[PDB]
Amino acid sequence: SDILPAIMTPLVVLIGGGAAMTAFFYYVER
Amino acid sequence: MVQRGSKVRILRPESYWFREIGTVASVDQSGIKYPVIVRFDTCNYNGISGTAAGINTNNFGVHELEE
Amino acid sequence: VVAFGTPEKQILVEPIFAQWIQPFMSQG
Amino acid sequence: KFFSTAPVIALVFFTLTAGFLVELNRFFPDILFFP
Amino acid sequence: LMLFINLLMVFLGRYAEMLATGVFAHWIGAGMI
Amino acid sequence: KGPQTTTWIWNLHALAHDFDTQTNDLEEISRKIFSAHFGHLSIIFVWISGMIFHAARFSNYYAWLADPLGNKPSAHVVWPIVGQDILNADVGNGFRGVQITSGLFHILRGAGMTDPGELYSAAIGALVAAVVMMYAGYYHYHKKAPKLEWFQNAESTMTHHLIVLLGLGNLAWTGHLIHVSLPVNKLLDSGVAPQDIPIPHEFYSDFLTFKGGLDPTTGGLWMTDIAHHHLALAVMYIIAGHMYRTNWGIGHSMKEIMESHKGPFTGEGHKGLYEVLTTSWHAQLAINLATWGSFSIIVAHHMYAMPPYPYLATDYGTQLNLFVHHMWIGGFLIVGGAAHAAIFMVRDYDPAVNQNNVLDRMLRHRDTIISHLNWVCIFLGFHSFGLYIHNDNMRSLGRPQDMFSDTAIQLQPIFSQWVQNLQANVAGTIRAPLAEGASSLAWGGDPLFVGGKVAMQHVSLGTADFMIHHIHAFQIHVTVLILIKGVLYARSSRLIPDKANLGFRFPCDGPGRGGTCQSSGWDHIFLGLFWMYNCISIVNFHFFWKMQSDVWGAANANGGVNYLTAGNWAQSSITINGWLRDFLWAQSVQVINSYGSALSAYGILFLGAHFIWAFSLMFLFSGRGYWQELIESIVWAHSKLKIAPAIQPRAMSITQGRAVGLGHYLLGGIVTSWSFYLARILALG
Amino acid sequence: SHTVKIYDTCIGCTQCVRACPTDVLEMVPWDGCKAGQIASSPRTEDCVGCKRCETACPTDFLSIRVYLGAETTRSMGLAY
Amino acid sequence: LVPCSESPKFQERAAKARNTTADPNSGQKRFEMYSSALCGPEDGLPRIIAAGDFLIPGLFFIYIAGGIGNSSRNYQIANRKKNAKNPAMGEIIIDVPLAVSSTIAGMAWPLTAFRELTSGELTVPDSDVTVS
Amino acid sequence: TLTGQTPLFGGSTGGLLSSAETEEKYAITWTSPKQQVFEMPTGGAAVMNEGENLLYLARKEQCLALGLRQLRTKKIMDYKIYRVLPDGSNTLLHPKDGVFPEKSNEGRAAVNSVARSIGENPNPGAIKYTGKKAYD
Amino acid sequence: ELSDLQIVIALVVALLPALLALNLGSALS
Amino acid sequence: LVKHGGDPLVGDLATPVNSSGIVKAWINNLPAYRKGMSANARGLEIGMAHGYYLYGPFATSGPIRGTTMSLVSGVLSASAVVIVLSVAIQIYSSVSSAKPLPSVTTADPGSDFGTKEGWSAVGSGFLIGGCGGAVIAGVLSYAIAAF
Ligand code: CL7
Ligand code: CL7
Ligand code: CL7
Ligand SMILES: C=Cc1c(C)c2cc3nc(c4c5[nH]c(cc6nc(cc1[nH]2)C(C)=C6CC)c(C)c5C(=O)[C@@H]4C(=O)OC)[C@@H](CCC(=O)OC/C=C(\C)CCC[C@H](C)CCC[C@H](C)CCCC(C)C)[C@@H]3C
Ligand SMILES: CCCCCCCCCCCCCCCC(=O)OC[C@H](COP(=O)(O)OC[C@@H](O)CO)OC(=O)CCCCCCCCCCCCCCC
Ligand SMILES: CC1=C(C/C=C(\C)CCC[C@H](C)CCC[C@H](C)CCCC(C)C)C(=O)c2ccccc2C1=O
Ligand code: SF4
Ligand code: SF4
């Protein structure tokens, strides 16, 4: 779990930020 | 409170001239809620931005006015 | 005055009450 | 009339006050504190 | 010289004020020289 | 009528020169305007007299004229009262005075004025020119108001102002040059002492060449080339002025030419423009200020690249001061041009007159223009400033190989580099032929050295120069976007269809429609001035840093130049940290360390300018509201004490708050840069 | 939309109604004041909120007061 | 903190001094004058302590400030008594006779202050003071 | 059905956008004495044809700006403003009574007239959690 | 010095407030 | 070629740029507008074109450029961008009601954009096309380099 940074960071920033932005988009556009 | 001339201190809280002496210039009209028409020396803020002059005379309430 | 090269002429006011009260560093 | 008008009146007054203070400073040296 | 005279004669053609036509021809001569 | 509110005073000063407002008839207006133009010319004559007078009376002019390299021009002695004596500098040969940067001395030497008598004569000449120009105004207004017809006579006025002034002024000046200036400068170069040189009353390939480049002694252009140039222009302008129709059958009528020019795309073409131009002062002031500003900017570039006057090149202080002064005047004038184009569009625009002409067609596609400018500004924004950001990130991330630079990823300004090769190598026998050399060394040159100093050299162009050029393109387009938007939407928008009616200056049309603050054409000039400031600030910085890293310097033992900043432009100007560190931080060392020296005044003005600038944020960031509330509390405190003034004190107009915000922002920012430049170049250069 | 409320002290100068750029205001007959009129605001779905009305009103504590809320296409002043 | 005479730094500053006024002796005169005041040992720069230092020039300042304030107040009274409409050519245009009278009655404010304080002439009643 | 002749205009970009179709246009119809030239509020100069002229604009303020500033100046006070829905519902708005709102006419109620003057409006502290506004 | 067992347990614990934050957020909406 | 206004009250000027024949030909036959395409087809062509284009900036300009791995960057980057656009289409369509309106350039836009069905179809197209585009461009880059 030295690599956990290289997984957690893209997951949270890119994937989570993406999913968050998508969800907030649905939320404010529905 | 005389129509030709007077010294009324306005007690209307929402007024530019609250607590200022003013000279009435019109007879209190029958059936007019605010018929004093006191003329105050100082001008009001009235006017578009950078309008120098404003309003000198407003139809003040009789109750609000006081000799 | 400092620019004109006469720092003497500065209005240096000493903080007397700070001296009176004075962890505490020199109040000039 | 021109004399009465603020700009000229003030121009003269301050060109006097400024010159007066300049003259004072010219004559008396740097006075930081009352001697 | 002939060239300058030729230009003045042609300048009348251009016009078709006399001073103006001549002036133009003079400059054309200056260019040719 | 009466001064009831403090706003009256402000309004007085504001609309005092708004002849359009005060008057109703173009006649009375044009009379006022003509009279004023005289007044103004007198102000300029006073000022010119002042400059040549100070050069005569309080100057090291004669010493400088003797030995320019040694001496530093200083026609500005300061009275010692509060210890400001220190502002008087050791400029050499023991003269103590404020080192002037106007280049007045270079002007006079170029004019071939060597005699103190001559200089006093010039001073008094210009001063009587002032005394007559102000009276001429009085005469032409009070005594004898001119006639509307004369004004509308644009064809006459063109022919006149183009031969009488341009053609004849250039011939006149070439006389004054070849006869007085050119031989005097020849003698002074040969080494004839100022005293030795004869007074003026005492009294073709030799004096007219196409050498190009610079006089290697003086560092200026060969005054032979100057004479030949001015003569050329005299010739051209005499002809060109003959190509109009004044009070005869000979020439082109402007209205004929204009109405001729139509086309597929431009519908009815220029039909109606002569009418609006003649009837509308503002239209004229717009076109003029736009071209006048544009002229000052060409001045700036030309005077640095082809330093006309003798020894100017070597005088780095003047070369900078003049580029920067002219850039400022340029930007300010260009914006006033836009201003008066908007004032025209609001006041002096008739839909009657303009009907499917080029102006109407502009207004009719004004969304495509604003939209496209918007786009080109975003585009350029990103592909100029965003390239610096890119580089800040890459360089800070230690990925210099990923940067835009002469190294790594390279954006070579090839069009410009090409034009440069095409002007350096293409000396003779192309288009206009028989040019012995390049018009300037800027195109391509080995450094010409006058004394230790590099007079002028190849101003290179790399990635740094591509980038900063796109920064200029970006900021000029944004300034155009703001200005052209304020012009084309001064009449109306989708937001406020009756803007024409609301006026040119109005604070807003109130809080509705989401808010309409700053929707007026005036408000567009407000915002345009901040972008013109940002634009010209970066142009002046680009100049300062490029000059002092790549052009200016000192010749050491080896051929190499000792550039003022040692060529850090190429690598340091391609990041914002580059600019903060290697330009503002690195180069503010003179102005910040200037206290207790000759340049202390630049230090003080650096601080005071920072203060005026910050202070303007008070005006720009706040609204009339808060201030009138606070003002009335303060008035209550004067009322308690019976000090309350006759003129009720009113928080300044919304528009005035903005105008002083902007005034202080501009004064502060400009003076700040001015302090920094002067301290650095007076000290170092 | 913006609620436009006309208060007791309306001196029926007809200044507001001539100001309103979306003609929200109609000068209606009223026995309350010497003027014989008052200001009415039927068409407040067309109130942009410019407050040119308030700006034009000459009475101290102006009777015409516009209260901005629930911005719509017509309030927000959108062509689009 | 220590007399400037005593402080060795101040003597160093005195040796090399910048002359403000044209006269060569202005620098030396200034330092000689400044010798009286107390100055910090490291700095050797005259300091100001909150009577000669601050109180006396404070008094002079206050006298002049009171003078100019009083003169303005007096001229305001002259404005509201000269004409039915005070502002028009009363503030924008300055009546030199009224002003000079106001100035002459100015600088007498210290004696005048006692009378003004008596019966609260200066203060106007809260009731009168216009405040929304 | 709100029929007039469209003022001779070369076209602009200042006109109706998708909202014209999607939501609601407006239409100003006025009677012109002459074929005179007027500033188009969209930006430009159009020439009103002789007699009834119909103009489809994008908001009421655009219509009332043509009317109040330009037409009324030309002394043309015949203009009628119609909210046009997509279905073609043309609804007269501006002179709803047929008389300019400045002139007092009967059968027009006092709308949003408030008895109490500005001064006397209630403080919000008092009315907290009632859901009544000060002006209300 | 911190072992993988520990890093995992920390994550698994942190997952609990995650679920409960989702729950509380939902509630407060 | 002159500027004229179809329906002069609408804010749309016919110009040589929006109403010319050559232009109308090109625009109206691009896969957004081209008549007689399944929405899926519209998307597959738009996608392929963009994926293929997108490969280039990424492969050429990115951080690992020059290396062999740059081709893989190019393809994955372009595909990532296409996946993000695929998300954008889905969420757009989810919340979109609006239909492409007839314009000067395109008198009959169509329904493929303007119905939730259409956008889903287009997006499925766009995704497959885009990632295909990007892969094809990398394959061709490797091919041409080798050859
Ligand atoms: C800033 C760009 C600008 C320029 C360069 C410019 N104008 Mg205009 N300009 C005029 C003419 C004009 C001329 C002849 C002219 C010549 O070049 C210019 N302008 C130029 C008059 C027709 C007309 C009125 C002229 C009139 O208002 O001008 C009177 C002067 C004013 C108020 C004083 C304030 C000027 C600066 C604050 C002072 C700067 C001095 C110094 C740098 C810093 C201070 C030094 C120190 C004290 C610290 C005018 C308009 C106006 C505006 C505006 C915004 C402008 N302008 C703008 C400009 C109207 O509102 C206004 C108008 O209402 O629209 C019609
Ligand atoms: C976030 C901070 C940042 C900024 C502001 C920034 N970069 Mg960088 N940035 C780049 C440019 C760039 C530009 C032009 C730019 C301008 O704003 C910026 N950046 C800005 C490239 C050099 C590089 C490449 C990134 C990369 O390649 O991104 C993809 C680029 C693409 C998809 C856009 C290409 C745009 C089209 C060509 C437009 C053409 C339109 C056409 C005309 C229309 C008509 C078509 C038809 C009808 C005819 C990049 C980097 C990179 C990074 C990183 C981290 C950054 N950056 C960072 C930043 C790389 O690693 C990476 C690094 O490797 O650097 C080498
Ligand atoms: C928000 C509703 C939603 C859910 C619940 C969901 N997806 Mg998708 N989803 C995928 C996986 C997936 C998994 C494994 C999964 C559940 O385990 C889900 N999804 C679930 C990938 C195969 C595929 C591409 C990769 C994909 O987008 O992310 C990979 C999936 C992850 C790590 C598992 C987490 C589950 C998330 C809730 C899905 C996140 C989708 C989000 C909207 C976009 C985030 C940013 C994005 C640009 C990466 C995908 C699609 C995609 C979309 C969209 C709009 C969605 N989704 C939406 C959702 C693409 O267009 C997009 C599209 O390309 O496909 C048509
Ligand atoms: C640093 C100060 C500042 C910035 C950054 C700024 C930014 C800009 N101003 C613009 C305009 C204006 N500004 C105006 C008034 C002002 N603008 C001011 C100060 C600024 N204005 C001030 C102080 C004023 C008051 C006078 C006006 C009146 C206009 C315009 O009309 C003009 C405009 O809008 O034109 C369209 C835009 C220029 C066109 C453009 O888009 O370029 C591109 C964007 C740039 C250069 C900003 C930085 C972009 C960088 C490269 C970031 C890249 C993006 C990354 C991906 C970061 C995203 C991070 C997320 C992932 C979290 C741009 C948004
Ligand atoms: C150094 C860099 C430049 C710094 C200054 C730049 C300022 C630019 C700000 C924009 C102004 C453009 C022109 C607008 C001109 C204009 O009309 O502005 C309009 C502005 C406000 O007009 P309003 O619309 O608010 O007034 C309303 C009335 O017109 C009716 O409502 O007026 C003022 O700013 C009032 C103050 C005038 C000036 C007050 C100072 C008086 C002394 C000035 C002395 C100057 C000496 C100069 C000597 C050379
Ligand atoms: C500070 C500020 C004010 C207040 C500033 C004012 C009222 C400046 C006017 C007062 C100055 C001090 C003018 C000088 C007044 C007289 C000339 C007084 C005589 C001075 C003698 C002593 C010489 C505004 O009015 C304002 C309006 C809109 C946006 C921002 C602001 C803003 O920021
Ligand atoms: S609120 Fe004002 S403008 Fe409106 S009717 Fe009353 S007095 Fe007239
Ligand atoms: S806010 Fe403006 S549009 Fe709305 S009612 Fe008042 S004056 Fe009329």
Residue numbers in the entry:
A (entry chain bI): 3 to 32
B (entry chain bE): 1 to 67
C (entry chain bB): 443 to 464, 511 to 516
D (entry chain bJ): 16 to 50
E (entry chain bK): 21 to 36, 61 to 77
F (entry chain bA): 41 to 243, 272 to 753
G (entry chain bC): 2 to 81
H (entry chain bF): 28 to 77, 84 to 165
Excerpt from the paper describing this PDB structure:
Acaryochloris marina is one of the cyanobacterial species that can use far-red light to drive photochemical reactions for oxygenic photosynthesis. Here, we report the structure of A. marina photosystem I (PSI) reaction center, determined by cryo-electron microscopy at 2.58 Å resolution. We show the architecture of this PSI reaction center is composed of 11 subunits and we identify key components that help explain how the low energy yield from far-red light is efficiently utilized for driving oxygenic photosynthesis.
The A. marina PSI monomer contains 11 subunits (PsaA, PsaB, PsaC, PsaD, PsaE, PsaF, PsaJ, PsaK, PsaL, PsaM, and Psa27), all of which could be assigned to the cryo-EM density map. PsaX (a peripheral subunit in other cyanobacteria such as T. elongatus), PsaG, and PsaH (subunits in higher plants) were missing in the density map, consistent with the absence of their genes from the A. marina genome. The cofactors assigned are 70 Chl d, 1 Chl d′ (an epimer of Chl d), 12 α-carotenes (α-Car) but no β-Car, 2 Pheo (a derivative of Chl; however, unlike Chl, no Mg2+ ion is coordinated by the tetrapyrrole ring), 2 phylloquinones (PhyQs), 3 iron–sulfur clusters, 2 phosphatidylglycerols (PGs), 1 monogalactosyl diacylglycerol (MGDG), and 84 water molecules. The Chls of special pair P740 are Chl d′ (PA) and Chl d (PB), which are coordinated by residues His678/A and His657/B, respectively. In A. marina PSI, we identified three water molecules (W1 − W3) around PA. They form hydrogen bonds with surrounding amino acid residues (Tyr601/A, Ser605/A, Asn608/A, Ser741/A, and Try745/A) and one Chl d (Chl d 32). However, we found that there was no Mg2+-derived density at the center of the tetrapyrrole rings of A0A and A0B, but rather a hole in the cryo-EM density map. This indicates, when combined with the result of pigment analysis, that A0 is actually Pheo a, a derivative of Chl a. The present study reveals that the axial amino acid residues at the A0A and A0B sites are Met686/A and Leu665/B, respectively. The amino acid residues surrounding PhyQ (A1A and A1B) are switched compared with those in T. elongatus PSI—Met720/A and Leu665/B in A. marina vs. Leu722/A and Met668/B in T. elongatus.
